[PDB]
Amino acid sequence: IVYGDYNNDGNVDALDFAGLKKYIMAAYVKNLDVNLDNEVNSTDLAILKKYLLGMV
């Protein structure tokens, strides 16, 4: 139940960013739909990008 946590490891980091990019280049994964619009697409990737750059 942790948004952005692609590989379910308790961290939201570059590994998740890469996993999301691969995913979109290839279904519905709830914790990857970070804007809750019932799609996982490049908008979710862009949101995760901005999050990672603003995190700390």
Binding site: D13, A14, L15, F17, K21, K49, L52, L53, M55, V56
Partner: protein, 142 residues
């Protein structure tokens, strides 16, 4: 055994703009780098960041490399958006940070540090479990 990520150093006088490199080593040994994010701290009363630019080891930096700086933290995010074809495969400079030096009354060395957070992915985007991080600094000499 581990990916080395090292912040280097620089020096100058108040008002100078200096370049601090961020270097990767043992890249091939760790199966290349496909993605990474990390966070550096600096003293914002002594340094202001002017720019952050990808180094020679990053291919297609305009697409694959991003950074942001705010109030004492610099963020970095790299991803090979081709997944297989623009990996970091060589040892060398990953990024160059340009800081403008602020005023000091006596010669001072101030740290540029790794803050907690982020991860490094190898050439298959799998976690690199051992990353040896070395903090850097800037020396301001009035």
């Amino acid at each position: 055994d581990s990916l080395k990520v090292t912040v280097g150093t620089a020096n100058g006088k108040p008002g100078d703009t200096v370049t601090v490199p961020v270097t990767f080593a043992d890249v091939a040994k760790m199966k290349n780098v496909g993605t990474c994010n990390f966070y550096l701290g600096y003293d914002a009363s002594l340094l202001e960041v002017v720019s952050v630019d990808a180094g020679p080891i990053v291919k297609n930096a305009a697409v694959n490399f991003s950074s942001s700086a705010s109030n004492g933290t610099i963020s970095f995010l790299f991803l090979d958006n081709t997944i297989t074809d623009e990996l970091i495969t060589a040892d060398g400079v990953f990024a160059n940070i340009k800081f403008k030096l602020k005023s000091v009354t006596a010669k001072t060395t101030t740290p540029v540090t790794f803050k907690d957070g982020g991860a490094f992915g190898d050439g298959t985007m799998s976690k690199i479990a051992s990353v040896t991080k070395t903090n850097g600094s800037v020396t301001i000499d009035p």
